[PDB]
Amino acid sequence: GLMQFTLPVRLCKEIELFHFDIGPFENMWPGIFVYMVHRSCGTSCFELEKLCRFIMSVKKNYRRVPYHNWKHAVTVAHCMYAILQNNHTLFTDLERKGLLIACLCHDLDHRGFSNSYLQKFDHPLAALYSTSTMEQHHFSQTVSILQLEGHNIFSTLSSSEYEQVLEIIRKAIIATDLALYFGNRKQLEEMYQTGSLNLNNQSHRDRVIGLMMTACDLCSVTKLWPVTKLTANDIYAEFWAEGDEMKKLGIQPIPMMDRDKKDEVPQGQLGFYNAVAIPCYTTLTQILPPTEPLLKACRDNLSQWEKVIRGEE
Numbered sequence: 001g002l003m004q005f006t007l008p009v010r011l012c013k014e015i016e017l018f019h020f021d022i023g024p025f026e027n028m029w030p031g032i033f034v035y036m037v038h039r040s041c042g043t044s045c046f047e048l049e050k051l052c053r054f055i056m057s058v059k060k061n062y063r064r065v066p067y068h069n070w071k072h073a074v075t076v077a078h079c080m081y082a083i084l085q086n087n088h089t090l091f092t093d094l095e096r097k098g099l100l101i102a103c104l105c106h107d108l109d110h111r112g113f114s115n116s117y118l119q120k121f122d123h124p125l126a127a128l129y130s131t132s133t134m135e136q137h138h139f140s141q142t143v144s145i146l147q148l149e150g151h152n153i154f155s156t157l158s159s160s161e162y163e164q165v166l167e168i169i170r171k172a173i174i175a176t177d178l179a180l181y182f183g184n185r186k187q188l189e190e191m192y193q194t195g196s197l198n199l200n201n202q203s204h205r206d207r208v209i210g211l212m213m214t215a216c217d218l219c220s221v222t223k224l225w226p227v228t229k230l231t232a233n234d235i236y237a238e239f240w241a242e243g244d245e246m247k248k249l250g251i252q253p254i255p256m257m258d259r260d261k262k263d264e265v266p267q268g269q270l271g272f273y274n275a276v277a278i279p280c281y282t283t284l285t286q287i288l289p290p291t292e293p294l295l296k297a298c299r300d301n302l303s304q305w306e307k308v309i310r311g312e313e
């Protein structure tokens with residue numbers, strides 16, 4: 001009750017910034033997450049004992065893959081922490097509770113392969129869920145862990161508040177399917193520009209939380225350049241193994257997944273910043289002005305990839 005989590009001074013100050021990197025000490029990541037729930041939600045949001053047991057069951061259900069791992073989960077939750085803390089009064093008590101958990105759980109039991117690879121392989125998950133295949137799995141793992149004994153962190157909510165929070169989590173996790181992001185951002189663009197965007201309209205809020213989910217999920221492009229650059233190695237290490245597996249099914253993969261085309265990574269990153277990242281943080285900044293540092297950091301990293309192409313590194 002009177003038991004705060006507290007971080008060393010450098011972490012206590014830098015964790016509040018969007019570009020914070022959670023560091024290589026895995027054993028500190030649970031404490032970092034609890035610190036974030038406590039400050040963004042309250043010391044009363046979750047029973048410490050259940051929250052600690054839930055965090056460790058979530059950790060155990062992330063796999064040892066290069067990129068879609070436990071560090072990614074805590075990293076995406078920290079980006080959400082930064083958004084919520086810079087937009088204090090815009091979010092409900094339930095949204096605060098739900099979104100950090102959603103972020104922590106959003107890639108539960110990821111195998112390092114895309115929805116497309118699961119469909120070409122004819123993985124059982126692709127017959128159980130025909131679209132957003134991994135994301136419906138991630139939500140399914142979240143509910144499994146919430147129903148283990150001593151793991152129900154939402155036990156103090158009413159039956160209707162409980163259903164509302166699980167519904168925020170489901171929509172937030174589904175939204176991390178990048179195939180869905182393009183249309184969600186186009187709609188948000190049009191609504192913001194014709195002045196129809198209405199944060200009391202539940203279907204509008206849903207869209208805004210979806211875009212926040214994309215922004216947190218892609219937040220590697222908003223780090224300091226050496227963090228961005230080293231993360232990109234992990235990202236391609238997964239895509240290239242997927243490419244290897246496509247070649248084993250007798251299918252030439254797309255060039256993004258073909259390790260034989262490493263040389264094109266810099267040009268690929270430009271496409272991605274221009275087509276996905278920049279548009280994402282631009283619309284987010286329009287809707288939530290205090291998230292502008294994410295857009296500024298993204299643009300700095302685009303300028304760094306332009307330098308790579310010009311052989312200035």
Ligand SMILES: Cc1nc2ccccc2nc1CCc1nc(-c2ccccc2)cn1-c1ccccc1
Nearest residue numbers: 218220221235255256261264265268269271272275
């Ligand atoms: C998905 C992705 N997600 C990321 C998430 C966070 C940070 C970095 C990320 N990088 C990528 C790869 C971004 C890319 N590389 C390529 C690529 C690379 C090498 C050879 C050929 C193509 C294309 N494209 C791409 C372009 C436009 C739209 C979509 C993908």
Ligand SMILES: [Mg+2]
Nearest residue numbers: 106107134176
């Ligand atoms: Mg995912």
Ligand SMILES: [Zn+2]
Nearest residue numbers: 106107176217
């Ligand atoms: Zn993710």
